């Protein structure tokens, strides 16, 4: 909802956000990381 929270966008490669400050914080929780520079979040891989 409030922010892009999936593997589809930024891909830890965007030319001003690729240095995502959460490089272990996701895998240490078992969930997947998203790189928005300092606005770096993780998230569950989800199911349907």
Q: Is 1 exposed, middle or buried (0-12, 13-18, 19+ CB in 10 A)?
A: exposed
Classify residue 13: in a domain, yes or no.
Answer: yes
Asked whether residue 36 is assigned to any structural domain, the reply reads yes
Structural domain count, the chain: 1
14 neighbors 5 (Cβ within 8 angstroms):
no
How was this entry determined?
NMR
**Nearest Cα to Cα of residue 37 among 15, 8, 5, 24:** 15
State which residues form the domain around 1. Answer: 1-43
Residues 9-42 as b/e (b if ≥16 CB within 10 A, e otherwise) read ebeeeeeebeebebeeebeeeeebbbbbeeebbb
Task: State both tokens at 30.
Answer: 């078992």
- Residue 32 belongs to some domain of the structure: yes
Which CB contacts under 8 angstroms, 24+ apart, belong to 39-47?
A: 39/3, 41/3, 41/5, 43/5, 43/6
């Amino acid at each position: 909802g409030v922010h892009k929270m999936a593997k589809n966008e930024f891909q830890c490669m965007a030319n001003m956000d690729m240095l995502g400050n959460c490089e272990k914080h996701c895998q240490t929780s078992g969930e997947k990381g998203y790189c928005h520079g300092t606005k770096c979040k993780c998230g569950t891989p989800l199911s349907y």
